[PDB]
Amino acid sequence: PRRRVIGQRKILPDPKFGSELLAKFVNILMVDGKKSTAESIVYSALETLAQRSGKSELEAFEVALENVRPTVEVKSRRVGGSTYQVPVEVRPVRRNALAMRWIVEAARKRGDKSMALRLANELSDAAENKGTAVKKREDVHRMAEANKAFA
Amino acid sequence: ARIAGINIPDHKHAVIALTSIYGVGKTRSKAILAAAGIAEDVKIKELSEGQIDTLRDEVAKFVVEGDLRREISMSIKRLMDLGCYRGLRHRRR
RNA sequence: GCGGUCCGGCCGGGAACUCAAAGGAGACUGCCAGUGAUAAACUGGAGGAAGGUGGGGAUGACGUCAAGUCAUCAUGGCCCUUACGACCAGGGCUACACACGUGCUACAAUGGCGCAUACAAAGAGAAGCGACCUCGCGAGAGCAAGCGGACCUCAUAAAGUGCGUCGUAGUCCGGAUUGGAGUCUGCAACUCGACUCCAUGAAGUCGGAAUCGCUAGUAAUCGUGGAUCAGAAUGCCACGGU
């Protein structure tokens, strides 16, 4: 940061609904500067079928986040070369920007063509912390304790 | 009952059975199978025995099956090897 | 809005109502607060159908670079020619147990098929596109006439939807080549070309080193097309996309 200023931009939260768990909302992986149709199949993950599910229509977003929490990870700056990670406590700014990427990946595992069939094996019978949504909970703690002693 | 010559249709229907063979495909299964009153949504094990022998002769008359595929089908390449034609002269080198 | 229908506004007829023609619109940090050497300038928020060169396109300094394609005619030069000039049959710009430089055949867990609904974006319109009915089981080869035009066509157009079979197979997941019949575009298939049927199926299960593509309509792959029209797009002055 010799001269670069650090600003997290944020133009608008989801239109139909929205929570405060989105640190930066910005168009990416799509045309930027135009927001005609970025919200079509984004809201397809609260409940795939009302009949085949005994959970809530709003609490399902919070149950898929408390089970995926990285205890001790590396930092993206990596100013020095080789393998030297400066211990930096996970910042609350990291748990709201890239934390939403691991939620969809946890519900996306079986090879299909319809994203909706994957939800019938990850939310209708695996949202009670069965063990398919803990792939990033114990993996972060297991990787640590090794590179803590570097600076 | 053995409907095909090569194998026997088990746990299948009458349309998907005559598909992997070379003699009958997607366009030949709608000319002799729909000539008589037979349902396609019913399994083979739940059909009448009186209409099984009537459909066996339909795929045997003027229709090459799996056993006759080596007997008469092909077997022309070997008989026309003496006569030279432009085609064999461009696909040899 | 308001009257008949074929229910595609096919025509009686009205405007501010999904678009228009010689001309004028129009959205540019415009106002306030905070911050900033009070200026310049930045991150939000009242209005409003369009907020941060709105977006896209025409648009493009020899200040670097003597190195870029002269298979546009020496193009005011300098030049060469009967055997470096010509009509041309035949010796011929010839990939043979076929290696990504101009043409996608392939990449073989991304495989194939009969089934009762309003919207039409493009393209074309005096030596040219062709109505409708009849008619076309593979490729080919055809029947048939309003109209010198707001009435046809190119254009039969890969994915989706979704009981199986097959089992991590040397093949039902596929269709290079070794070997065999025809039509058409035709002096002309001998050498050296394209549309459609075939059996034995040969190398293969996602990849060494080196090297390298990816950010103001980003993307993957078995797919089209008005243009030259001898062999009827995959390569894009285009158009239309899930």
Bin the helical content of chain B. Answer: 10-25%
Please tell me how large the radius of gyration of chain A is. 18 Å
Number of contiguous helices of chain B: 3
Overall, the morphology of chain A is globular
Main sheet: strands, sense, barrel of chain B? none
Kindly state the number of beta strands of chain A: 0
Query: In DSSP terms, counting alpha (H) and pi (I) runs of 4 or more, how many helices of chain A?
Result: 4
In N-to-C order, the SSE pattern of chain A is HHHH
Class derived from helix and strand content of chain B = mainly alpha
Derived structural class of chain A: mainly alpha
Count of beta strands of chain B: 0
Distance between the termini of chain A: 19 Å
Instruction: Kindly report how far apart the N and C termini of chain B lie.
Output: 49 Å
Largest sheet of chain A: none
Strand content of chain B: under 5%
Over all CA atoms, what is the radius of gyration of chain B? Answer: 18 Å
User: What oligomeric arrangement do these chains adopt?
Assistant: part of a larger assembly
Q: What portion of the residues of chain A fall into strands of 2 or more residues?
A: under 5%
Shape of chain B: elongated
* Topology order of chain B in helix (H) and strand (E) letters: HHH
Helix share bin of chain A = 10-25%
Give keywords.
part of a larger assembly, 2 chains, A: 151 residues, mainly alpha, globular, B: 93 residues, 15% helix, RNA-binding, ribosome, 30S, RmtC, 30S ribosomal protein S7, 30S ribosomal protein S13
Write the layout of secondary structure elements.
This is part of a larger assembly, with chains A (151 residues) and B (93 residues).
Chain A: H1 60-66, H2 101-106, H3 115-118, H4 138-143
Chain B: H1 52-56, H2 68-71, H3 86-90
Chain B binds one RNA strand of 242 nucleotides through residues 11-13, 15-16, 19-20, 22, 26-31, 34, 69-70, 73-74, 76-81, 83, 85-93.
